Design a binder for these strands. Structure first.
Length: 294
DNA sequence: CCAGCAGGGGTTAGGGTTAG
Protein backbone atom coordinates (compact mmCIF):
# COMPACT_ATOMS: atom_id res chain seq x y z
CA UNK A 1 0.00 0.00 0.00
CA UNK A 2 1.86 3.05 1.31
CA UNK A 3 5.48 3.35 0.14
CA UNK A 4 7.31 6.25 1.76
CA UNK A 5 10.14 7.78 -0.27
CA UNK A 6 13.26 8.82 1.66
CA UNK A 7 15.37 11.68 0.36
CA UNK A 8 19.16 11.56 0.82
CA UNK A 9 20.35 14.56 2.81
CA UNK A 10 22.40 15.82 -0.15
CA UNK A 11 19.30 15.93 -2.39
CA UNK A 12 17.10 18.08 -0.14
CA UNK A 13 15.44 21.01 -1.92
CA UNK A 14 13.84 24.02 -0.27
CA UNK A 15 10.08 24.28 -0.52
CA UNK A 16 9.35 20.56 -0.24
CA UNK A 17 8.06 18.14 2.40
CA UNK A 18 10.20 15.02 2.74
CA UNK A 19 11.01 11.93 4.79
CA UNK A 20 14.59 11.42 5.93
CA UNK A 21 16.85 8.98 7.75
CA UNK A 22 19.79 10.19 9.76
CA UNK A 23 22.29 9.76 12.57
CA UNK A 24 22.16 12.34 15.36
CA UNK A 25 25.30 14.50 15.47
CA UNK A 26 23.79 16.97 17.95
CA UNK A 27 20.49 17.54 19.72
CA UNK A 28 18.78 19.77 22.23
CA UNK A 29 16.32 17.73 24.31
CA UNK A 30 12.81 19.22 24.29
CA UNK A 31 12.60 22.49 26.20
CA UNK A 32 9.84 25.00 26.85
CA UNK A 33 10.10 27.66 24.16
CA UNK A 34 8.89 31.24 24.56
CA UNK A 35 5.85 30.18 22.51
CA UNK A 36 3.18 27.60 23.23
CA UNK A 37 5.26 24.52 22.36
CA UNK A 38 8.20 22.44 23.40
CA UNK A 39 11.08 22.77 20.95
CA UNK A 40 13.78 20.30 19.98
CA UNK A 41 16.77 21.01 17.74
CA UNK A 42 18.33 18.00 16.00
CA UNK A 43 21.26 17.96 13.57
CA UNK A 44 21.44 14.75 11.53
CA UNK A 45 23.85 13.30 8.98
CA UNK A 46 23.82 10.33 6.60
CA UNK A 47 26.22 8.55 4.23
CA UNK A 48 26.50 11.66 2.02
CA UNK A 49 28.29 13.51 4.90
CA UNK A 50 25.84 16.41 4.38
CA UNK A 51 24.25 17.56 7.63
CA UNK A 52 20.75 18.90 8.24
CA UNK A 53 19.58 20.89 11.27
CA UNK A 54 15.92 20.36 12.18
CA UNK A 55 13.76 22.69 14.27
CA UNK A 56 10.85 20.73 15.74
CA UNK A 57 7.88 22.01 17.72
CA UNK A 58 5.13 20.22 19.59
CA UNK A 59 2.73 20.64 22.47
CA UNK A 60 3.44 17.00 23.42
CA UNK A 61 6.89 16.43 24.92
CA UNK A 62 7.01 12.81 23.75
CA UNK A 63 5.89 13.64 20.19
CA UNK A 64 9.30 15.22 19.62
CA UNK A 65 12.15 12.86 18.63
CA UNK A 66 12.95 10.46 21.46
CA UNK A 67 16.72 10.97 21.37
CA UNK A 68 18.91 9.96 24.31
CA UNK A 69 22.45 10.38 22.95
CA UNK A 70 24.42 11.30 19.86
CA UNK A 71 24.65 8.39 17.47
CA UNK A 72 20.97 7.53 17.83
CA UNK A 73 19.29 6.84 14.49
CA UNK A 74 16.24 8.89 13.52
CA UNK A 75 13.59 8.60 10.83
CA UNK A 76 11.41 11.65 10.13
CA UNK A 77 8.14 11.75 8.18
CA UNK A 78 6.63 14.98 6.81
CA UNK A 79 9.56 17.28 7.54
CA UNK A 80 9.39 20.60 5.69
CA UNK A 81 12.63 21.75 4.06
CA UNK A 82 13.11 25.51 3.78
CA UNK A 83 15.85 28.14 3.65
CA UNK A 84 16.39 30.29 6.73
CA UNK A 85 19.17 32.92 6.67
CA UNK A 86 20.58 31.43 3.46
CA UNK A 87 20.92 27.97 5.05
CA UNK A 88 18.97 24.74 4.63
CA UNK A 89 16.67 24.00 7.56
CA UNK A 90 14.23 21.23 8.43
CA UNK A 91 11.11 22.22 10.34
CA UNK A 92 7.94 20.62 11.67
CA UNK A 93 5.14 20.20 9.14
CA UNK A 94 1.57 19.04 9.72
CA UNK A 95 1.60 15.40 10.76
CA UNK A 96 5.36 15.30 11.46
CA UNK A 97 6.31 11.90 12.85
CA UNK A 98 9.50 10.56 14.43
CA UNK A 99 11.00 7.12 14.97
CA UNK A 100 14.31 6.69 16.80
CA UNK A 101 16.61 3.73 17.39
CA UNK A 102 19.71 2.77 19.33
CA UNK A 103 22.83 3.21 17.21
CA UNK A 104 24.85 0.36 18.72
CA UNK A 105 25.74 -2.42 16.29
CA UNK A 106 23.99 -5.76 16.77
CA UNK A 107 21.36 -4.28 19.09
CA UNK A 108 17.71 -5.07 18.28
CA UNK A 109 15.95 -2.58 16.02
CA UNK A 110 13.20 -1.29 18.30
CA UNK A 111 11.48 1.95 17.22
CA UNK A 112 11.06 4.61 19.89
CA UNK A 113 8.03 6.80 19.18
CA UNK A 114 4.88 8.30 20.63
CA UNK A 115 2.91 7.47 17.48
CA UNK A 116 0.12 4.97 18.06
CA UNK A 117 0.68 3.55 14.57
CA UNK A 118 3.64 3.90 12.23
CA UNK A 119 4.78 2.44 8.94
CA UNK A 120 7.79 0.14 9.11
CA UNK A 121 8.99 -2.33 6.47
CA UNK A 122 11.91 -4.73 6.03
CA UNK A 123 13.65 -2.00 4.01
CA UNK A 124 13.42 0.30 7.05
CA UNK A 125 15.12 -2.35 9.19
CA UNK A 126 17.88 -2.63 6.58
CA UNK A 127 18.37 1.15 6.39
CA UNK A 128 18.69 1.38 10.17
CA UNK A 129 21.34 -1.37 10.09
CA UNK A 130 23.24 0.44 7.33
CA UNK A 131 23.24 3.75 9.21
CA UNK A 132 24.50 1.90 12.30
CA UNK A 133 27.48 0.44 10.43
CA UNK A 134 28.22 3.74 8.69
CA UNK A 135 28.18 5.61 12.01
CA UNK A 136 30.48 3.00 13.53
CA UNK A 137 33.02 3.64 10.77
CA UNK A 138 32.54 7.40 10.20
CA UNK A 139 31.78 9.07 13.56
CA UNK A 140 34.02 9.10 16.61
CA UNK A 141 32.32 7.71 19.74
CA UNK A 142 31.55 10.47 22.22
CA UNK A 143 34.22 11.05 24.87
CA UNK A 144 31.62 12.95 26.92
CA UNK A 145 29.65 9.98 28.32
CA UNK A 146 31.79 9.48 31.43
CA UNK A 147 31.17 7.73 34.72
CA UNK A 148 31.74 9.80 37.85
CA UNK A 149 35.09 8.11 38.49
CA UNK A 150 36.32 9.25 35.05
CA UNK A 151 35.41 12.95 35.27
CA UNK A 152 38.09 15.63 35.23
CA UNK A 153 37.77 19.19 36.55
CA UNK A 154 36.99 22.11 34.24
CA UNK A 155 35.13 19.96 31.73
CA UNK A 156 31.69 19.42 30.24
CA UNK A 157 30.30 15.90 30.14
CA UNK A 158 27.08 13.90 29.96
CA UNK A 159 26.07 11.90 33.02
CA UNK A 160 23.89 8.79 33.17
CA UNK A 161 22.73 8.51 36.77
CA UNK A 162 19.94 7.86 39.26
CA UNK A 163 18.20 10.63 41.18
CA UNK A 164 18.20 10.27 44.98
CA UNK A 165 17.20 13.71 46.25
CA UNK A 166 15.72 17.08 45.34
CA UNK A 167 15.72 20.45 47.10
CA UNK A 168 14.80 24.07 46.48
CA UNK A 169 17.57 26.65 46.86
CA UNK A 170 17.00 30.28 45.82
CA UNK A 171 14.40 30.02 43.05
CA UNK A 172 16.99 30.69 40.36
CA UNK A 173 18.68 27.34 41.10
CA UNK A 174 17.67 23.87 42.23
CA UNK A 175 19.53 20.94 43.79
CA UNK A 176 19.60 17.36 42.49
CA UNK A 177 21.46 14.63 44.38
CA UNK A 178 22.43 11.87 41.95
CA UNK A 179 24.75 8.88 41.77
CA UNK A 180 26.00 6.24 39.35
CA UNK A 181 27.76 3.77 41.67
CA UNK A 182 31.26 5.16 41.09
CA UNK A 183 33.19 7.59 43.29
CA UNK A 184 34.42 10.92 41.96
CA UNK A 185 38.20 11.52 42.02
CA UNK A 186 37.54 14.43 44.39
CA UNK A 187 34.72 14.70 46.95
CA UNK A 188 31.59 16.37 45.61
CA UNK A 189 30.71 19.82 46.86
CA UNK A 190 27.68 20.14 49.13
CA UNK A 191 25.33 22.99 48.20
CA UNK A 192 23.87 25.01 51.08
CA UNK A 193 20.15 24.22 51.48
CA UNK A 194 17.64 23.78 54.29
CA UNK A 195 17.49 20.21 55.58
CA UNK A 196 13.68 20.09 55.76
CA UNK A 197 13.56 20.77 52.01
CA UNK A 198 15.42 17.59 51.02
CA UNK A 199 12.92 15.40 49.14
CA UNK A 200 13.76 11.70 49.07
CA UNK A 201 14.66 8.72 51.29
CA UNK A 202 16.83 10.26 53.99
CA UNK A 203 18.49 7.09 55.33
CA UNK A 204 19.17 5.83 51.80
CA UNK A 205 20.70 9.24 51.01
CA UNK A 206 22.75 9.03 54.21
CA UNK A 207 24.27 5.62 53.58
CA UNK A 208 25.10 6.60 49.97
CA UNK A 209 26.80 9.88 50.99
CA UNK A 210 30.27 8.92 49.74
CA UNK A 211 28.92 8.15 46.24
CA UNK A 212 26.38 10.96 45.77
CA UNK A 213 27.08 14.22 43.96
CA UNK A 214 25.21 17.50 44.29
CA UNK A 215 24.19 19.10 40.99
CA UNK A 216 23.01 22.70 40.93
CA UNK A 217 20.78 23.42 37.93
CA UNK A 218 19.82 26.98 37.00
CA UNK A 219 17.18 29.02 35.19
CA UNK A 220 15.11 26.98 32.67
CA UNK A 221 16.38 23.71 34.16
CA UNK A 222 14.77 24.45 37.54
CA UNK A 223 11.21 23.76 36.41
CA UNK A 224 12.42 20.53 34.83
CA UNK A 225 14.37 19.46 37.90
CA UNK A 226 11.32 20.21 40.04
CA UNK A 227 9.20 17.71 38.09
CA UNK A 228 11.62 14.78 38.36
CA UNK A 229 10.68 11.67 40.32
CA UNK A 230 13.11 10.47 42.99
CA UNK A 231 14.53 7.10 41.95
CA UNK A 232 14.12 7.62 38.22
CA UNK A 233 17.08 7.35 35.87
CA UNK A 234 18.38 10.47 34.15
CA UNK A 235 20.84 11.63 31.55
CA UNK A 236 22.12 15.14 32.25
CA UNK A 237 23.78 16.72 29.23
CA UNK A 238 26.73 19.12 29.24
CA UNK A 239 27.07 19.11 33.01
CA UNK A 240 30.00 21.33 34.04
CA UNK A 241 32.57 20.23 36.63
CA UNK A 242 34.69 22.76 38.52
CA UNK A 243 37.41 21.95 41.06
CA UNK A 244 36.96 24.46 43.87
CA UNK A 245 39.88 25.16 46.22
CA UNK A 246 38.55 26.56 49.51
CA UNK A 247 41.57 27.51 51.63
CA UNK A 248 41.21 29.02 55.11
CA UNK A 249 44.09 30.26 57.29
CA UNK A 250 45.85 26.89 57.72
CA UNK A 251 43.81 24.45 55.63
CA UNK A 252 43.20 23.73 51.96
CA UNK A 253 40.30 21.74 50.54
CA UNK A 254 39.52 20.46 47.03
CA UNK A 255 35.94 19.75 46.01
CA UNK A 256 34.16 19.02 42.74
CA UNK A 257 31.22 21.27 41.88
CA UNK A 258 28.64 20.23 39.29
CA UNK A 259 26.64 22.95 37.53
CA UNK A 260 23.90 22.69 34.90
CA UNK A 261 24.03 26.27 33.65
CA UNK A 262 21.04 28.03 32.14
CA UNK A 263 20.24 27.95 28.45
CA UNK A 264 20.17 25.16 25.89
CA UNK A 265 23.45 25.33 23.92
CA UNK A 266 25.52 22.12 23.64
CA UNK A 267 22.41 20.18 24.64
CA UNK A 268 22.37 21.32 28.29
CA UNK A 269 19.31 19.68 29.73
CA UNK A 270 17.87 16.59 31.34
CA UNK A 271 16.08 13.57 29.93
CA UNK A 272 14.46 10.73 31.87
CA UNK A 273 15.68 7.36 30.59
CA UNK A 274 13.29 4.40 30.68
CA UNK A 275 14.26 1.15 32.35
CA UNK A 276 14.11 -0.52 28.92
CA UNK A 277 17.21 1.51 27.97
CA UNK A 278 20.39 -0.57 27.90
CA UNK A 279 22.59 2.11 29.48
CA UNK A 280 20.12 1.93 32.37
CA UNK A 281 20.73 -1.84 32.58
CA UNK A 282 24.49 -1.35 32.93
CA UNK A 283 23.97 1.54 35.37
CA UNK A 284 21.70 -0.72 37.44
CA UNK A 285 24.43 -3.35 37.72
CA UNK A 286 26.84 -0.70 39.01
CA UNK A 287 24.22 0.68 41.43
CA UNK A 288 23.46 -2.76 42.87
CA UNK A 289 27.08 -3.62 43.62
CA UNK A 290 27.79 -0.13 44.99
CA UNK A 291 24.73 -0.22 47.25
CA UNK A 292 25.83 -3.65 48.45
CA UNK A 293 29.25 -2.44 49.57
CA UNK A 294 28.30 1.11 50.63
C1' DC B 1 0.59 10.13 11.66
C1' DC B 2 -3.86 11.34 12.43
C1' DA B 3 -8.75 14.90 14.89
C1' DG B 4 -8.67 15.40 10.42
C1' DC B 5 -7.17 11.32 5.35
C1' DA B 6 -11.40 15.25 -1.47
C1' DG B 7 -5.20 17.31 4.10
C1' DG B 8 -3.87 19.39 8.86
C1' DG B 9 -4.15 28.07 12.53
C1' DG B 10 -1.67 31.23 14.16
C1' DT B 11 4.19 31.40 17.71
C1' DT B 12 7.87 29.28 19.20
C1' DA B 13 13.62 29.20 17.18
C1' DG B 14 16.68 29.17 13.92
C1' DG B 15 23.02 24.31 17.88
C1' DG B 16 28.14 26.65 19.62
C1' DT B 17 28.99 26.26 27.21
C1' DT B 18 29.03 34.23 31.30
C1' DA B 19 27.97 32.45 35.68
C1' DG B 20 25.30 31.94 39.91
Amino acid sequence: ATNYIYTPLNQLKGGTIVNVYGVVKFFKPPYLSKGTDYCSVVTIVDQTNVKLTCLLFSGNYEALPIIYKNGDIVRFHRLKIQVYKKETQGITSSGFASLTFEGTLGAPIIPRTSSKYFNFTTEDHKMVEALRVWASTHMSPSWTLLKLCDVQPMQYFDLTCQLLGKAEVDGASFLLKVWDGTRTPFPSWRVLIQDLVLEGDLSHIHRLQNLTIDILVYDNHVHVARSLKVGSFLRIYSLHTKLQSMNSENQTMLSLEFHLHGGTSYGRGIRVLPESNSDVDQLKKDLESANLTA
